[PDB]
Design an enzyme around this catalytic site. Structure first.
Site, PDB file in Angstrom:
ATOM      1  N   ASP A   1      10.891  -7.290   3.093  1.00 39.91           N
ATOM      2  CA  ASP A   1      10.675  -6.502   4.308  1.00 39.91           C
ATOM      3  C   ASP A   1      10.953  -7.349   5.537  1.00 39.91           C
ATOM      4  O   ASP A   1      11.526  -6.856   6.516  1.00 39.91           O
ATOM      5  CB  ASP A   1       9.266  -5.865   4.357  1.00 39.91           C
ATOM      6  CG  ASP A   1       8.113  -6.862   4.127  1.00 39.91           C
ATOM      7  OD1 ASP A   1       8.301  -8.031   3.729  1.00 39.91           O
ATOM      8  OD2 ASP A   1       6.952  -6.423   4.349  1.00 39.91           O
ATOM      9  N   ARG A   2      10.551  -8.622   5.490  1.00 38.06           N
ATOM     10  CA  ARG A   2      10.845  -9.539   6.597  1.00 38.06           C
ATOM     11  C   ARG A   2      12.345  -9.772   6.747  1.00 38.06           C
ATOM     12  O   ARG A   2      12.866  -9.761   7.864  1.00 38.06           O
ATOM     13  CB  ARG A   2      10.108 -10.853   6.396  1.00 38.06           C
ATOM     14  CG  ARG A   2       8.617 -10.637   6.194  1.00 38.06           C
ATOM     15  CD  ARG A   2       7.954 -11.969   5.855  1.00 38.06           C
ATOM     16  NE  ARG A   2       7.727 -12.762   7.056  1.00 38.06           N
ATOM     17  CZ  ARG A   2       7.068 -13.910   7.074  1.00 38.06           C
ATOM     18  NH1 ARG A   2       6.607 -14.446   5.947  1.00 38.06           N
ATOM     19  NH2 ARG A   2       6.892 -14.530   8.240  1.00 38.06           N
TER      20      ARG A   2
ATOM     21  N   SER B   1       4.965   3.113   0.292  1.00 36.30           N
ATOM     22  CA  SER B   1       6.409   3.002   0.142  1.00 36.30           C
ATOM     23  C   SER B   1       7.046   4.046   1.029  1.00 36.30           C
ATOM     24  O   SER B   1       6.694   5.235   0.948  1.00 36.30           O
ATOM     25  CB  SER B   1       6.815   3.229  -1.317  1.00 36.30           C
ATOM     26  OG  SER B   1       6.330   2.188  -2.160  1.00 36.30           O
ATOM     27  N   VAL B   2       7.974   3.604   1.873  1.00 29.56           N
ATOM     28  CA  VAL B   2       8.685   4.507   2.763  1.00 29.56           C
ATOM     29  C   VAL B   2      10.023   4.887   2.144  1.00 29.56           C
ATOM     30  O   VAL B   2      10.745   4.026   1.653  1.00 29.56           O
ATOM     31  CB  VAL B   2       8.919   3.857   4.125  1.00 29.56           C
ATOM     32  CG1 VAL B   2       9.784   4.739   5.006  1.00 29.56           C
ATOM     33  CG2 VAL B   2       7.580   3.573   4.798  1.00 29.56           C
TER      34      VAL B   2
ATOM     35  N   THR C   1     -22.954  -2.736  15.187  1.00 23.40           N
ATOM     36  CA  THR C   1     -22.177  -3.401  14.147  1.00 23.40           C
ATOM     37  C   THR C   1     -20.721  -2.955  14.161  1.00 23.40           C
ATOM     38  O   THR C   1     -19.810  -3.786  14.085  1.00 23.40           O
ATOM     39  CB  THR C   1     -22.798  -3.187  12.782  1.00 23.40           C
ATOM     40  OG1 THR C   1     -24.135  -3.693  12.816  1.00 23.40           O
ATOM     41  CG2 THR C   1     -22.005  -3.929  11.711  1.00 23.40           C
TER      42      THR C   1
ATOM     43  N   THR D   1       0.817  -1.205   0.000  1.00 27.37           N
ATOM     44  CA  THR D   1       0.000   0.000   0.000  1.00 27.37           C
ATOM     45  C   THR D   1       0.855   1.260   0.000  1.00 27.37           C
ATOM     46  O   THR D   1       0.584   2.192  -0.762  1.00 27.37           O
ATOM     47  CB  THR D   1      -0.984   0.027   1.182  1.00 27.37           C
ATOM     48  OG1 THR D   1      -0.260   0.017   2.402  1.00 27.37           O
ATOM     49  CG2 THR D   1      -1.874  -1.188   1.150  1.00 27.37           C
TER      50      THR D   1
ATOM     51  N   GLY E   1       9.652 -12.503   2.171  1.00 32.46           N
ATOM     52  CA  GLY E   1       9.487 -11.108   1.743  1.00 32.46           C
ATOM     53  C   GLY E   1      10.692 -10.285   2.146  1.00 32.46           C
ATOM     54  O   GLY E   1      11.225 -10.450   3.237  1.00 32.46           O
TER      55      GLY E   1
HETATM   56  C1  LIG Z   1     -22.162 -10.609  10.166  1.00 37.01           C
HETATM   57  C2  LIG Z   1     -22.882 -11.275   9.040  1.00 37.01           C
HETATM   58  C3  LIG Z   1     -22.397 -10.827   7.678  1.00 37.01           C
HETATM   59  C4  LIG Z   1     -22.695 -12.777   9.195  1.00 37.01           C
HETATM   60  O1  LIG Z   1     -23.330 -13.487   8.176  1.00 37.01           O
HETATM   61  C5  LIG Z   1     -24.349 -10.970   9.124  1.00 37.01           C
HETATM   62  O2  LIG Z   1     -24.904 -11.406  10.333  1.00 37.01           O
HETATM   63  C6  LIG Z   1     -24.693  -9.522   8.979  1.00 37.01           C
HETATM   64  O3  LIG Z   1     -24.725  -8.989   7.838  1.00 37.01           O
HETATM   65  N1  LIG Z   1     -24.958  -8.881  10.001  1.00 37.01           N
HETATM   66  C7  LIG Z   1     -25.379  -7.504  10.111  1.00 37.01           C
HETATM   67  C8  LIG Z   1     -24.552  -6.741  11.131  1.00 37.01           C
HETATM   68  C9  LIG Z   1     -24.740  -7.137  12.558  1.00 37.01           C
HETATM   69  O4  LIG Z   1     -25.146  -8.226  12.794  1.00 37.01           O
HETATM   70  O5  LIG Z   1     -24.456  -6.317  13.395  1.00 37.01           O
HETATM   71  C1  LIG Z   2       3.849 -10.835   3.916  1.00 37.86           C
HETATM   72  C2  LIG Z   2       4.151  -9.563   3.155  1.00 37.86           C
HETATM   73  C3  LIG Z   2       3.047  -9.245   2.192  1.00 37.86           C
HETATM   74  C4  LIG Z   2       4.282  -8.426   4.137  1.00 37.86           C
HETATM   75  O1  LIG Z   2       4.531  -7.209   3.519  1.00 37.86           O
HETATM   76  C5  LIG Z   2       5.478  -9.739   2.436  1.00 37.86           C
HETATM   77  O2  LIG Z   2       6.494  -9.991   3.374  1.00 37.86           O
HETATM   78  C6  LIG Z   2       5.567 -10.803   1.365  1.00 37.86           C
HETATM   79  O3  LIG Z   2       5.077 -10.552   0.222  1.00 37.86           O
HETATM   80  N1  LIG Z   2       6.110 -11.897   1.615  1.00 37.86           N
HETATM   81  C7  LIG Z   2       6.332 -12.968   0.683  1.00 37.86           C
HETATM   82  C8  LIG Z   2       5.967 -14.305   1.324  1.00 37.86           C
HETATM   83  C9  LIG Z   2       6.738 -14.692   2.557  1.00 37.86           C
HETATM   84  O4  LIG Z   2       7.339 -13.881   3.206  1.00 37.86           O
HETATM   85  O5  LIG Z   2       6.676 -15.871   2.874  1.00 37.86           O
END
Ligand SMILES: CC(C)(CO)[C@@H](O)C(=O)NCCC(=O)O
Ligand SMILES: CC(C)(CO)[C@@H](O)C(=O)NCCC(=O)O
Lengths: 248, 248
Positions: A108-109, A15-16, A182, A13, A106
């Site tokens: 970063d890791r 880049s630093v 919610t 998301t 990765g």
């Molecule tokens: C949380 C889900 C998506 C699970 O199916 C559903 O119960 C839902 O859309 N709920 C509305 C939000 C709530 O229950 O507060």
């Molecule tokens: C897990 C992320 C996405 C974190 O930025 C990155 O480290 C990555 O793409 N890793 C490659 C898979 C791995 O580290 O096993």
């Protein structure tokens, strides 16, 4: 002398971009990683941020987990500084990479583990809360593997996009035992829940390997800092690792 | 006599259709919820599944968390059975809905709570592992609220879509303390991690409300049932709630 280095952490998301002249104090900026960026676009964005510092850069080091972005960084480095970047990658030496395919870890890791071994010690657990949340285990200077979890924003976004009724909720911890609406339900499930997930993974690691220090880092870590037991908080861990890997 | 009822649970991913002649035993089928479905498409899918039973249906009860699908279910009920469905919703009666906006509680959660109080008791924690994973707390027949977490598949999919490098991993528990490749890392973080998250939330509830029985249900629950402490495993819980709410 004290040559200036540009350190880059290309995440999914954000880049630093960071400059340092000693590998101990860092000036830091963040940009969106953004699709189809070009080297001129990158320069244009960095120009008013780095100002005078721009012309002093002597080396560019990069950890990237977005391969399509790598050509842009390479072209920026070559066009504007006439140098090629140094790319963080798992290699033998200072860390032993005790996993099935170290090349797939990765960057970063890798940077996090390198920074940890250089600055903090041979034994620890690294939690990096970013686009994904990673857990990385280092024992006697050996990288042992870890865990990958969806990041906090990734989780709230997935609930929003993946259901009909759920809204996109701001990432904020629950200060209640059960949610009464919610938004509260989602905060408790995603934020507190992810902390519990991490505590469970860390706990089981500690049962097998003993009581290791935990370092916390990542752009999403500051909001839950109080919720997870940790011995070190270091927001610059990844960039430090890029510096150590590339410029020693 | 023993009138046959059709019970429907319209989820974000899957729609469960179940018939019962007594509210004790249930035959069930599952279809995809599928966009832009029509009443004739639904009948066509159900025709070879229900066979001769189709003509015997006397009432249709529905819990739905996908409002756009509701018109299709209504038209299906009216066109093929000349009846209107009964829609599960929070209302006063056997359950007190002790949250801020009971009208916003998902109908599946409502159905689960109704089924629990009717079949199991006045005190419990319900874990329903579906598209999202919900935690629901009932204390002395009062629904107190709960938590919403991304479901297991939602989690692995979010990691795949939301990063450059991560693959889409099959949901399978980790039998290791740290993952030694990418897929293992994700299984540990998502599957084991979500179980830890649930145990944390359940544990905090129990500290405040006492040692309540835990019920597990949902399409994604069977894979993890040996990993979570529970007193009741009932995959028909939601459909039972539809039955109790609609037909007593
Ligand atoms: C949380 C889900 C998506 C699970 O199916 C559903 O119960 C839902 O859309 N709920 C509305 C939000 C709530 O229950 O507060
Ligand atoms: C897990 C992320 C996405 C974190 O930025 C990155 O480290 C990555 O793409 N890793 C490659 C898979 C791995 O580290 O096993």
């Amino acid at each position: 002398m004290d040559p200036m280095y540009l350190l880059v952490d290309v995440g999914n998301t954000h880049s630093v971009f960071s400059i340092t002249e000693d590998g101990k104090t860092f000036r830091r900026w963040r940009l969106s990683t953004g699709v189809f960026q070009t080297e001129d676009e990158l320069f244009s964005h960095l120009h008013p941020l780095l100002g005078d510092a721009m012309r002093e850069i002597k080396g560019i080091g990069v950890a990237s987990v977005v391969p399509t972005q790598n050509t842009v960084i390479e072209r920026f480095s070559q066009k504007y500084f006439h140098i090629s970047p140094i790319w963080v990658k798992a290699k033998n030496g200072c860390v032993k990479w005790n996993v099935k395919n170290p090349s797939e870890v990765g960057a970063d890791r890798v940077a996090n583990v390198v920074a940890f071994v250089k600055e903090y010690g041979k034994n620890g657990i690294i939690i990096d809360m970013g686009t994904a949340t990673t857990v990385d285990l280092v024992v006697n200077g050996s990288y042992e593997g870890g865990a990958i979890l969806p990041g906090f924003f990734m989780m709230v976004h997935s609930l929003f996009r993946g259901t009909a009724k759920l809204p996109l909720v701001e990432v904020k911890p629950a200060d209640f035992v059960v949610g009464k609406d919610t938004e509260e339900n989602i905060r408790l499930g995603v934020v507190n829940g992810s902390v519990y997930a991490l505590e469970g993974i860390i706990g089981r690691i500690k049962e097998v390997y003993g009581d290791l220090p935990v370092v916390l880092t990542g752009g999403q870590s500051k909001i839950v800092k109080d919720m997870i037991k940790h011995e070190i908080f270091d927001e610059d861990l990844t960039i430090k690792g890029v510096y150590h890997f590339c410029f020693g």
